Amino acid sequence: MFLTRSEYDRGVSTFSPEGRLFQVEYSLEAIKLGSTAIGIATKEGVVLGVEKRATSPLLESDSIEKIVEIDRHIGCAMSGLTADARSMIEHARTAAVTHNLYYDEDINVESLTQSVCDLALRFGESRPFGVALLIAGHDADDGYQLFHAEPSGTFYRYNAKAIGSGSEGAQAELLNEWHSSLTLKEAELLVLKILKQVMEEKLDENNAQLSCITKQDGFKIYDNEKTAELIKELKEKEAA
């Protein structure tokens, strides 16, 4: 093992000779270390899935929630639930309700994604802020949309995106599998298939949580029983 350091490392708000801000680069790779979240967008819905930590049998429920409702139209997934994730979510919630009472109309998903990025450029009020988000929603202009909002205060729209544990091979299988033609059921099976591969081959309703956005029901997180029949549908469909 050898050492590869540099004189411009840990430089805050400082360009290196190359024009690099290494702090925001470092923050942007810590997204590899969290719990796995996956988003699939289709003409039928946006599906968000996340790996759940195993819990004591005595735990009846908890306020750890890596998939969160922002609005009826908009849902969100984290790889970590630090104070900065809470700050971004309660900013996104306050941004949604203020737009609703101003225009009598639902916020566009790009405009909400832009708003949580502006919070990270402001640092609340060249620093990174908080954690990677997947942001999913439907609006009448740009349909079903999935965005990666980043600690840098910048973002991209994706057709499918994986964050957290598993990054290189997690997005490698998604670009191999994604179609314009995916049905919603098929997208759910695909996020469960990807979750099984990243989890070193374990899959229960106790370690996979699913959700989707549709126009008709909006954002909903699936019951353990709904994800359990979907896991059985995966287990038979791969064995067939």
Binding site: F2, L3, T4, R5, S6, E7, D9
Partner: protein, 719 residues
């Protein structure tokens, strides 16, 4: 470092190259952590211990035959190829003590004389020329590390016929670069200047070769050589006639008078700077080492340049100037040439009379030298420093100095100046009775014939130990200088004895009465010190085959009959009895009339310390910076770990001076008290029992000094 085999080496070196390949990335400056100090101390110890093994083998080989386990030339070459990049990385570290471990490795590698040694010299000259040309301007660590790297290797560059041609160009470029704002860079430039000076003779080596000149001879060989090695080629490829090379060397030496004018002009600029006692001391040492390296032709130029600037300058305008930077150089001139002292000592006392008549020291303050007193302090500190080095030349103007001393003890009474003005007798009496080195020259007296190829000061040349090289003149007190020392001592002491008794009526606390008492008392304390080499710890035993090992040079006798038969011996002790009875009389006067006057008891306690401690020896002004070269400093410039005394004549001379000073100080002063010592001890015990902090703290410090001087004194103190 003891597992290698000179004749079967290849599998050992294959392991050592694989260690260095693993380690290199832990040595690079941006990679700091817990490994840094382990690696710096490992690389240093490996190269140092390998050097020690090579010198053990070279010593055994020189009395017989090579055994074949012995390290060969090929092993020394491998050691450079392995470690040169390790040393090159580790010398750019952010911690300076880390970088010094790797920088000290270059000296061990260069003393091994590998065929690869050009890699090290080329490395160091390229960095040094890129710093002095400001190519590393954004990058301060390069400037400091390059100066340190060059500083380490000057003594080897000086010995090589090709690289020696660069050194006076470097000395000139170093001296031009001394700053008044960058005390750290100036300290590192002064390290370079003193290292060049300690090895090189400041001399013009040109004979009737009047056609050669530094520019067009030395520089054309320093522009071709530098361009050749900077474009990636080596020094091994650089071929030139020995004749062009020797003309480039001889012409290098003609530039020294230009360098010395810039140097004096930097020394007079540094008087105005807020320096540090260690940097001031170092700047004095380099000025003195420059002087001891001059021939008489360059010395006679430098003396006049310095004396001229000392009179004609703009250089003492600040609150608290560095007088030492100019006054220690003048005292060093007069140590080399006694013939300068008569004019410099009559010009100084004229200017002191001018400043005293113009009103210097007419306005009282206890805490400060005032801005109007600064020139009086300059000429008095110059007088103190010059007089300390006058020796047998005081005999020409002794009466004129004694009448001047009286004028100075009449006319100036500012309490900050009484200390400066009373040091005048100390310096006078001290130079008349002291035995010490006069001559510290790199080459003696413009004499002997060690050839013109002496850029190195014989340091490695095996002829350094020679009696005709190390024949130092020394200084041995004359009988005229001893009849003058006693005339000064009893004249001044008796003088101040008739001044303070005619003024001991306790009229009032004028705030100017107390200063006149303090002055005449300070003069009585500056006469006991200075004349102290005349006194004798044993005088009381010899009332009205004893064996000493540390026998210093006394001018009365070593046997008791040799010294009792000289009447001059009794006379010296008689004056010290008369001074000691005066401090007891002054104690009962200040105890009965002036209790609580802290300053008057402090001066008395310092007088009593000097009277108790300075018998046959001097233990105040003993360890402050003076006009001799520092033995611990020149030994740090010149000492090599595995080489026997790799020293120049200056260092051998100041080592013989330090042996004499050691023999003087190691002489016993423990004695059986004399009724007057008991009386003055009991006065000191009462002052240690005083309730003013400012009296009891000095009086307790004097008491612990007195208890070392007197046998059985703890019993007296506790009783």
């Amino acid at each position: 470092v003891y597992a290698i085999n000179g004749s079967k080496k290849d599998r050992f070196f294959e392991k050592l190259v694989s260690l260095a390949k693993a380690i290199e990335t832990f040595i690079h400056p941006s990679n700091n952590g817990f490994w840094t100090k382990p690696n710096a101390k490992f690389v240093h110890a490996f190269i140092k211990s390998y050097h020690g093994r090579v010198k053990y083998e070279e010593d055994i080989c020189a009395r017989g035959v090579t055994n074949g386990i012995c390290l060969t030339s090929f092993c020394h070459e491998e050691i450079v190829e392995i470690f040169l990049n390790i040393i090159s990385l580790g010398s750019q570290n952010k911690n300076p003590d880390i970088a010094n471990y790797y920088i000290s490795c270059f000296a061990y590698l260069l003393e091994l004389d590998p065929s690869n040694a050009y890699l090290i010299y080329d490395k160091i000259l390229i960095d040094l020329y890129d710093t002095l040309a400001d190519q590393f301007i954004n990058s301060r660590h390069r400037i400091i590390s390059s100066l340190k790297q060059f500083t380490r290797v000057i003594r080897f560059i000086v010995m090589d016929k090709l690289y020696r041609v660069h050194i006076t160009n470097v000395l000139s470029m170093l001296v031009s670069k001394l700053d008044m704002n960058d005390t750290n860079l100036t300290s590192n430039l002064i390290n370079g200047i003193v290292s060049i000076a300690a090895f090189i003779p400041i001399q013009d080596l040109t004979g009737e070769d009047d056609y050669i000149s530094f520019e067009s001879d030395t520089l054309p060989l320093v522009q071709q050589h530098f361009y050749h090695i900077k474009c990636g080629e080596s020094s091994k490829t650089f071929r030139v006639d020995d004749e062009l090379l020797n003309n480039a060397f001889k012409a290098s030496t003609t530039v020294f008078q230009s360098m010395l004018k810039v140097y004096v002009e930097k020394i007079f600029q540094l008087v105005d700077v807020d320096l540090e006692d260690s940097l001031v001391t170092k700047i004095n040492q380099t000025t003195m080492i420059l002087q001891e390296s001059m021939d008489d032709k360059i010395f006679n130029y430098f003396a006049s340049l310095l004396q001229r600037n000392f009179w004609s300058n703009d250089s003492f305008k600040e609150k608290d100037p560095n007088y030492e930077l100019v006054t220690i150089p003048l005292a060093a001139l007069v140590r080399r040439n006694n013939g300068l002292s008569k004019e410099l000592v009559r010009t100084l006392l004229f200017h002191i009379k001018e400043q005293i008549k113009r009103g210097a020291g007419s306005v009282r303050s206890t805490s400060e030298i005032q801005q109007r007193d600064v020139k009086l302090v300059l000429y008095l500190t110059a007088l103190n420093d010059v007089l300390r080095q006058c020796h047998e030349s005081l005999l020409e103007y002794s009466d004129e100095l004694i009448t001047f001393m009286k004028y100075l003890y009449d006319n100036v009474t500012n309490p900050p100046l009484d200390v400066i003005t009373s040091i005048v007798i100390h310096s006078a009496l001290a130079t008349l009775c002291t035995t010490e080195i006069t001559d510290c020259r790199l080459f003696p007296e413009d004499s002997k014939i060690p050839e013109k190829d002496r850029w190195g000061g014989l340091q490695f040349d095996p002829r350094r130990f020679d009696k005709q090289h190390l024949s130092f003149q020394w200084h041995v007190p004359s009988s005229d200088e001893i009849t003058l020392s006693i005339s000064i001592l009893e004249s001044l002491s008796e003088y101040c004895i008739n001044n303070v008794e005619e003024l001991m009526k306790a009229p009032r606390h004028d705030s100017e009465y107390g200063d006149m008492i303090q002055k005449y008392v300070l003069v009585m304390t500056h006469t006991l010190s200075g004349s102290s080499l005349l006194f004798d710890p044993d005088f009381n035993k010899y009332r009205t085959r004893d064996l000493d090992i540390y026998t210093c040079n006394y001018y009365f006798g070593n046997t008791t009959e040799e010294k009792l038969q000289n009447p001059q011996y009794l006379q010296v002790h008689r004056v010290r009895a008369r001074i000691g009875h005066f401090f007891h009389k002054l104690y009962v006067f200040l105890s009965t009339n002036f209790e609580n006057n802290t300053n008057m008891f402090q001066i008395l306690l310092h007088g009593l310390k000097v009277w108790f401690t300075d018998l046959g020896q001097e233990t105040v002004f003993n360890e402050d910076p003076n006009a001799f070269i520092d033995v611990d400093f020149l030994e740090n410039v010149q000492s090599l770990s595995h080489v026997n005394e790799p020293f120049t004549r200056t260092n051998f001379a100041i080592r013989a001076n330090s042996l004499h000073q050691s023999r003087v100080l190691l002489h016993s002063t423990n004695r059986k008290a004399s009724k007057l010592e008991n009386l003055l001890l009991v006065d000191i015990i009462q002052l240690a029992t005083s309730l003013y902090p400012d009296i009891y703290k000095p009086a307790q410090g004097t008491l612990v000094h007195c208890m070392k001087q007197l046998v059985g004194s703890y019993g007296v103190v506790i009783n």
